[PDB]
Structures are given as C-alpha cells and as structure tokens.
Design a protein around this nucleic acid. Structure first.
Length: 50
RNA sequence: CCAUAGGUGCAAGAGGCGAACCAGGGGAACUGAAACAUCUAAGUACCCUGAGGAAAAGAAAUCAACCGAGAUUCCCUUAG
RNA sequence: AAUGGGUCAGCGACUUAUAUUCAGUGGCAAGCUUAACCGUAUAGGGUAGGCGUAGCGAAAGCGAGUCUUAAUAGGGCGU
RNA sequence: AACCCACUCCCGUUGAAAAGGUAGGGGAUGACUUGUGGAUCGGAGUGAAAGGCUAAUCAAGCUCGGAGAUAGCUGGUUCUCCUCGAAAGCUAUUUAGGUAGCGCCUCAUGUAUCACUCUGGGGGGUAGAGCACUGUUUCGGCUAGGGGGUCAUCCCGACUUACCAAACCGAUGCAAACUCCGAAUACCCAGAAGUGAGCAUGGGAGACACACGGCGGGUGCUAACGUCCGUCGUGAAA
RNA sequence: AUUAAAAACACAGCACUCUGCAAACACGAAAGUGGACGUAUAGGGUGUGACGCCUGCCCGGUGCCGGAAGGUUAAUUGAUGGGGUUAGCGCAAGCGAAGCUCUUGAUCGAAGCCCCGGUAAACGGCGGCCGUAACUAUAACGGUCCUAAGGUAGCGAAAUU
RNA sequence: AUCGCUGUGAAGAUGCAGUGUAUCCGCGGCUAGACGGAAAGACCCCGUGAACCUUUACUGUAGCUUUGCACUGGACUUUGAGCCUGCUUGUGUAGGAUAGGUGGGAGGCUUUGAAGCGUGGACGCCAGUUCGCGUGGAGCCAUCCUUGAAAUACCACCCUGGCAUGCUUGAGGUUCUAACUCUGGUCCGUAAUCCGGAUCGAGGACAGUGUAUGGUGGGCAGUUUGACUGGGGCGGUCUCCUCCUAAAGAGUAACGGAGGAGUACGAAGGUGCGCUCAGACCGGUCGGAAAUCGGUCGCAGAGUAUAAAGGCAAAAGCGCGCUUGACUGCGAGACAGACACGUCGAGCAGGUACGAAAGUAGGUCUUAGUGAUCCGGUGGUUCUGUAUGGAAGGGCCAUCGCUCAACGGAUAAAAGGUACUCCGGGGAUAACAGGCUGAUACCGCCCAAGAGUUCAUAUCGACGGCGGUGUUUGGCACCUCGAUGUCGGCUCAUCACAUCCUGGGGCUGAAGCCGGUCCCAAGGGUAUGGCUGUUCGCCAUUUAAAGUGGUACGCGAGCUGG
RNA sequence: UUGACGAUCAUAGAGCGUUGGAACCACCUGAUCCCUUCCCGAACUCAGAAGUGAAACGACGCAUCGCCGAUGGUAGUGUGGGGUCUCCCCAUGUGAGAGUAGGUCAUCGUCAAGCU
C-alpha cells in the first residue's frame, strides 16, 4: 500500500492523500470529489507524493 | 686589492624587590546537563612579560531613517 | 544479643544578598511610585523607567469586541 | 671464617625492635661486596619483570592552589504551652531505597446543611444449581455402522453376530476459561422525618519499605509469622 | 625492602626480520645528543632456551611483502542549467539586455581499498557417518559426508584423565 | 544492689513469667558465657559511584604517509588542449564530377578552360579529385547540356580532414647551474673547529620546511556498556487486542493459566432492488464415503477479509444496477480520565450519489494493525519582510521521513575485565550457625494378595492408607554486614534411648551348642593400624562389644592449619 | 359470515382430527400488450373469468409433545456470637433451583364489511 497524492483538476494546489496497492492495479484513478476552493465537486488524479 | 666582520678605549642608561590594581602572551579540570562526547564551568584558576601612579581607550571611512544625533570612559534603565 | 555515648566544664548546626509570588497590617487612590545622581547630606529635588486603567489574533490589523470561516450562522477567549 | 644474604623451627606480637633475637643454613676471586662524589622524576623514571622500588606512603608520590569539588547516601539538629491530624495507594519514569501530578491532612475565602445515616424505581450473571449448548463419564437397550467368528462361494450368496463400535432411546455423574436458569449483598437516582461539615478557588506540607488478624481467592504441599490481590478492623500514631 | 625463593625471570646457544651511514631506532616543540668517534663476521626488534636425535600437513581468515591492467576515491578547477535585481517595453498584465550576485555541478585529481599473486622459527587451524576377514568379537580393507586442510613421528590415567 | 532451670520474646535472657537454690569480703588457677576487646566487613548486592587495564565499543588525536600551493629556475623534447591564419580538403540513389552549406554569379574572355592524348604529385564513401601542362601559349564541365532533392564557370562568409607555425597550457622525458643543501676538504676570526665568513667538491630544482587535504593510527586521551528478578548470574520479558483469575456496577496484582496483531480493500465502501444456512436423508450417466441436478426434513447446529469474546430477520450473511458521503467548515452535549492523547454525536451551512417519494450516506458487525517534540524536504499562501523598492529567511495551512520494539522515546553518534582493586551504604539482600515448615528423610503403625512343602502373621509381606522425631536434600528470608572466625585432627567432656556389650525375660519352622524376633532396663564399659586433607569408606588383625544421635553438624580470648 | 392494520409475545406453540364458499380469498386461463428470468410467465407483472375449496387459508375439537407452575422443605447468604476451626453450628433478617398437586388448543383494539 504505497501512498499517493490526488492533485485537483482546476488551478488550485489543493490535493487529497491516500494509499494504493501499486502491485495489483498499475493504472491511475479519476475519482470525483469536493474542492474547498471552487466550492464544488471536480475530478482528481495523480500519484507520486515527492 | 679596497673594507665590513672582529677587537680595545670612553660616555650615557638598564638589571633587583614590592600586597592589590591595568594591558598583552599561554591557558585547564572537577562540576552543571539528575548518564555523556557539542555546550557549560570559563578565556575563570594558575603561569610568564610589560608599564603607571593609575592604566587602557579616544576626536568618526561612527549611529540613525528621509527626522536627525557628533569623541572616549563610568553608574541607572531599556530587558532577562 | 542492632546503632551511638567513660563522666564533667567550655564552644558546636536553617544564615545573608539580589529578584519575585501569596497572606497579615499601613499610605495615598483611576492612579500609585521613583533608580542612579544632585543636596547646608536620614529632609528636599530627581517621574527617565515600571505596574495599572481593554481585549482578541501566529501576524498585519481591528477594537467592547475580536479570531476561525464562503460566515453575517455556530463556537473560543473578553467585557 | 670476616663479609653480604634470608631456607627451617621455637620465642616475641601492649615487643628490647612500626620486621629482631638464639640455634641451625646458602654464596664466599667474582653475572662479587662496599666507602666517597655525581646522573636519570610523576601518566615520568628505573626494573635478570614481582606491578617491584622512587625518604616507615605507590594499578601512577609528597605539598600548596582550583575548592566550603560532588554525594537521590549514613550520622546529628538545642526553651514551654494550646486546637487539628495522616500515608506506606494509582499513573509515568535509565525507573524500583529518588522524584512528579491525582487520592488522603492543614489553614483561609466563597457558595451551598449541600451531603451523610432511614424508605421507592433500577440493570447484573457471582454463590448455588442444572445438563438445553460446548466438553468429559458410567451401565443398559436398539441398532447405523462398518463387521469380529466368518458359514464361506476359482472370483461373488449370504449362515453365523465370536469384532467391535457411531447414531438413537432410558437411567447416571462433573467443569475458572460450559449456561435453559438464579438469590443474599453491594451499587445508582428519586421521598420524605429526625439527629450531626458538602462543593470550588488559593497558601503549606508530609506519604508513595507497610505489618498482622477475620471473611472471599491465585500460587504453594488447600505447608510456612511464605508470597501476590479484594474488603473491614487493630498496630504504626493508644 | 616487611607472610610467597619457585617449576618463575636470566643465560650461553638457535632461527626469523629490519638497517648502506646524515643508518633502522630512541629522547627531545626545535637546536642537538645516544647509537658509535662503531660500518652488515656490524647494530636494533621478536620468539625459543646447554647437549643429543629431530621439527609433519594447511596461504581459506587476519597481517606483512610483490604487482599494476581495470574499477571506485580527497581537497583543487567550474563547463552547463536554474534563480535574484532592473535598462527597456507594455493601458495594464507581463516579458526582459548588459552588469552584479545565489545556487547547480561536467570534466581535471594521488596514495588507499576492491582485485592478482607470495610468505606459517608471522597471528593462527589440524572432521563425521556406517558396512566389513573359517568362533570371528574386532577392523587391515570399503563406502559416504564436509574442509583452506583434517594431526605424522614420538609420548600417553601424565604439573593435563 | 551483676545466680540456675523451664517457658515467652525482633524468633539463642544476669534484669520478663513461674519456681528452685545462696551468710558478707578476698587471694591463687582455668577459659564455658557476657552474640567478650581491636578494625563504619574485604565475601555478596546496590550507587544513572572512582580508578587502572583490554579490544574488532564510539568519538577523536601523537606519529608516519599521498597529493595541491609557496620557497622554485632554462634548455630541448614526447603529448592533451584551447588560438590563428589562408584555409587549399567536401567521393553514397544519380549528374559529366562533387554536395556542409546561406547571398552574388548564368556561364564564365588572366595563357579563353588551350585545348586533346597522355607528364608526376599526393591523393581517393577509387580509377573519384586537385595542382605542371610534355607539346605547345592550342577551347572548354555547358552556363538544365544534363540528370540529380540543391548545377557547375566564376566572388563572398564560415567549418572540416588536417597542412603547416605561431600564440598560449597542461602531463611526461632528458640535461644544465644560479636558488636551496652538505653531521666534505683547507684558510680566516682564534690560543676553540661550536658558530660564522671566504673559496674550491658533491648533490640540484629533487630533498626539506610552512599551509590545505586523503590514508593508516589502543601509540594516547575522554568516555559509554539498561531494568524487572521469591539473592543476581544464565534464560525469559519491556507496546497494543480478546477471554479467565475479578468477589452479578467501574476498577484491581503475580517470572498466574490460554491465544492473537506491527495489516488488507477503489470494492470487501454508499444506495436501491431482490434472496436464504449447514447438515440428514432417498432418486439419479464414466465421480462416488463425499462434485453437479431433484426432491422432502430443517427451524442458525452455517456464514462474518483477519484471534477470541459479545452479537446479527429492518438479517450486520448472499447476489445484481447506478456511484464516490473513504466529502469541506463545524458541533449542543456527554462518557472516560494525573497530564498529554482518547470515544460517541444530534443538529446547522456548503455542495453531492442513490430512490417514485418519505429517507439513507461524515468508510468496513464491533473491539488490535501503531511513535510526542526538535530537525529538515516538498505544495498553497502578502502576514512579516532590519534606510527605501524588491528578494532571502521566517510565520500560518496542507503533507513527507524515528524500531535503542528498553515501544512517555537520555545523544547526530557507545563493548568488555579486575583474584591489584578503592569510597559511600545494607541484615530493604546471599553464602556459615539459629528460627518457622516437612515435600525429602529416618522410626512406626493399619488392611493382607501372597511364600514360608501343608499353613497370611516363626520369619517376610506386593497393592494402598494414618502418624511421630527434627537427624539431611530442601522451601521462606524474621535476627546479625559501625565483623556471630567456616571443614577434619588433638585435649576435655555432658545428656537422650529409638540398646552395640553385660542383666531380667513371651514366641520360634527353639533337640543340644548356637540363633531369629519382639517387650523391660541408661549402672559401668564401648580397639590398635595401613591408604586418603578427609568425616566416610575399603582392607589386615583383634575383642565380652568395637552403639546411633543432640550439645553454634560440642570445643581456635584451649592447640594445630593438612 | 370475511378482509386489512395493530395490541400482547408460547397458558398465544407443534401434532392430530374435522370443516368453510360462489360475498371474500386462493388456486386457475393466456401473455398479445406493460414487465420479468446470469435458462425458464417458477417468482415478478399485465389482461381476465370459466373451474375448484383439492391444495392453501380460516374456524371448530383433542393435553398425546411442548410451555407455564403452586404450597412445604432444602441449598446459599447480610449483621452479631460460637465451636472439635482446610469445615460447620446458634440468635436474627432473607430465601432459590430442581421436583410435586395441577394448568393451557389464548385475550383484545380500529375500520371496511356478514344477523350484524
């Protein structure tokens, strides 16, 4: 369960942080979650915390 | 070879001692940290070299903010 | 049947200084008080400085309110 | 033999002596003994090496300074009276014989006679008891069972039932880590009568080595004035 | 020196190794002195200890000696990139020259180690399992297992059993 | 104003309780006691004590050694590299050749391109190319003449193979003298050969010395090396979860009995819609005790991501469709609790996913799956920004890297010895003796299967039970660490009786001599030697017999010291 | 005569036996059309009766299993005192579990609907 970052779609540097078992599923996820700057839901994506 | 070293003759000064004080040279450890290596203790103890009745330091290639203050030395605050 | 003391007479152990907190008793009182230093010197001057009379906030800042927050909602601290 | 040395016994141990004495021993022309004078020094000398000697001191002298070193460790702490009066528990610790917060004592300030001791509602799974579950146990029956004898078939039937043995019916016992059940007490909150001290903020501490006894328990050999807990009492401090 | 006189220390003898002279080595902040007014038949260090018969195998570990091919490897150099300021330009937003600076670090760098060999009178190390011969118990002989190699001569209930 | 004995008692009494004895006071002897006198125990444990030793503990250093920069020069050379210049070099499909090319030039008239055969050169992604033209001052490639991705002949810019030589510079090699060196020779100061100075001789840009840096370095130094512990050493254990001990509220110990964690999951989460287990049995193709299918009986005996406990029909269990509420700002109230951390949460506002709509969703049936502060690293952030304007550096918000796991974590960074030892303490704690206790011991006693030819009890007595003594192997840790001297021998002893000898005596498998066994009896006796430190033992020889225990395993202010 | 929704959770359960239609209810017919099946009109759904009370469902009977369950005694236990003291006894307050006598084939409420 390596840990990953989920950078927002819009311009803001707001992100979420979670973990993902890299070994079983290699591809990235596109979860739609809330954004505290634009005050509405957008979709997120990334990995690679550093 | 010249002429310096070197050697004599004279004049003037210094050398040694003393309790603390002052400026430089060299400079510990115990102990604190409830252990201990950075750090403290501490440039303190002690040890040398100078000088004076005091010494050192001093007359801006300094501080302040767009206002200004004009050498150093010492006490009281800023302030634990 | 653990320690100490042969008996007598002398001496022999919670102190000081500088900061600060709480109580007791006093002075002036939204104000109280001066340190060095001057001084015919225990008087007098000296109010620089300190504590108070208003807070909240990491800060700028705003103020009987202010901070967080999209907040004008709630809530923390304060009157 | 002088001389240098120190192998044995006894005496001495407040000695005559802070290392001797009386008897006996080893070397005694040499790696000898010794007189005078000099040289080597403190993490430093010397040493045919024992950690030996360096002024009766040596796994690093003696003396004066740093220095009234540091000591959760021992010992001691001095005149009278009056009111109140403990603890040897918990949590953490390079901690266990130290210390710090809460529990227990004291003196002030406040709010509350709060709050105790008597009577109404309330959960529980302990002693006991039980076998419905989980296990364990005895006998009897009826059997599955597989069979045990096996009648016994190249090799098949099934006689028999000598094997044993599920499972199921009936009687019968037992569990801290088993429950269809199930008290006494202890806890909570409410109601009142009488008699006699709760909460909160401040100052000051001491304690944190416990002892026995009764009633419930672990461990031990249901042994110890053994040892670790729960609760009441007495010592400590009568 | 003052509870231990020995089997302890010494020793003549033996071997190993370092030292070509302003020597190795020691004491000294340094000057210098010992060594030694000596010169490898000499001088330092380490072990064993007259004499007699002798001194076996293991170079993996650790140390010293020998070798450089290649790898890594120090300050020293500072290529390149990225960033600060601003002359300019832009309604603004922003891009931005030269200078000056702040980081980044390419190369350039020796011994050393890693490697490759030698040395055990250098520190050190020298195994197990079974089955086996006309009594045949026993094991000459035979398997197998592991290692850098698996204890020979001599001695043996011993200052060790 | 100082007796004995039996008890008690912080547990071995001249001083307590009970009861026996004793007229007051000396002198010579002896050493049983006064836990006798001397020495803050050295053995043993502790102290976040001290010394000095060891190494492969950690951090360093003396010393030795490598290379930069100084002191420090020229002469040639090999070789790297920058520099220059003029640059003349430029060969593949294919053009006549040849493409590094960008602008002028359409052709090019300096022997026109002299040609053209062949002249050498060096040349070659080779016959491909440049320069002499042998002749001789003689037309050429064709300027798209071609074709080729760009056409020549001519002027310009640069680059390349390199050509040369320069400019600088590194690295290596040789040589030279003038720096430095000489613990060489002979003059001088000097009557000295230390030290200078003069001159020859040797070495020579090396050696050596400063300063910066690598390596080696117990040669040397400052230091570290945990706790609980039925003594501490060895071993085991240090944090979190569930059950039992735990006494029907919470809580609650032991080196007390049993087990588990240091994670998984983008669906194993949300929501709507549906649906029920294991087992028993009988029927049924190659399975076959047991696969799939059908059926009746069931009444949770299954299941639950992961240990056990408590649960689960609105099923918290199973399937399918859409999805992201595994959301942001909060949070009245409480439960727990030394503190720091902790657990549950209605409701409000933002924006969402299901469902026709009420409504449900702030992760998973619940409880384990984890580590403060300081550091530093990365995204947002005007909040600050030391004259001013900016920046660097702070601050706040979000998030990453600790296993002294000794899990409230001493530091970025740590092992051992002491019989050479030392200081401060302790019977809060061990070894000797005492004390309480008897599992172990040793002495008995109850049932009696049996053998003893027959016959259980003349002698033994398996299987099992109930006691006594404190004698040895223990258990515990109450006394003593400002000292209670431990084993064997010598000397001297005293008491018990569970009797070795002698005395009296039931029974006998006792003919006689001898015996075996058990009751009564403590008066007197109760061996010399060999071997060992021995008590013990094993031997040789005796004797009426060579007893078993207590008395700090009697007895060191009585001796010895194996 | 029934049908819906509750109240109370076995003295309300299980088993056996009997019995009810054309009002209700259930089976039933067909899936064309809504709609459905990891295959199937089984279930789900739609248009619908004929036919039937068989099944199912309700009522009415049986204590055969189950379930409730007295009284008396007994176990244990709070406080005070005892004794022969790893266990019990006395005074006093409290008092099960198991078993016995026996019980149980439920009792209600709201509407629509059947004398009603």
């Amino acid at each position: 369960r390596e840990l990953i970052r989920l950078v927002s779609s819009a311009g803001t540097g707001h992100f979420y942080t979670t973990d993902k078992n890299k070994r079983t599923k290699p591809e990235k996820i596109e979860i739609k979650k809330y954004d505290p700057v634009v005050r509405q839901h957008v979709i997120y994506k990334e990995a690679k915390i550093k």
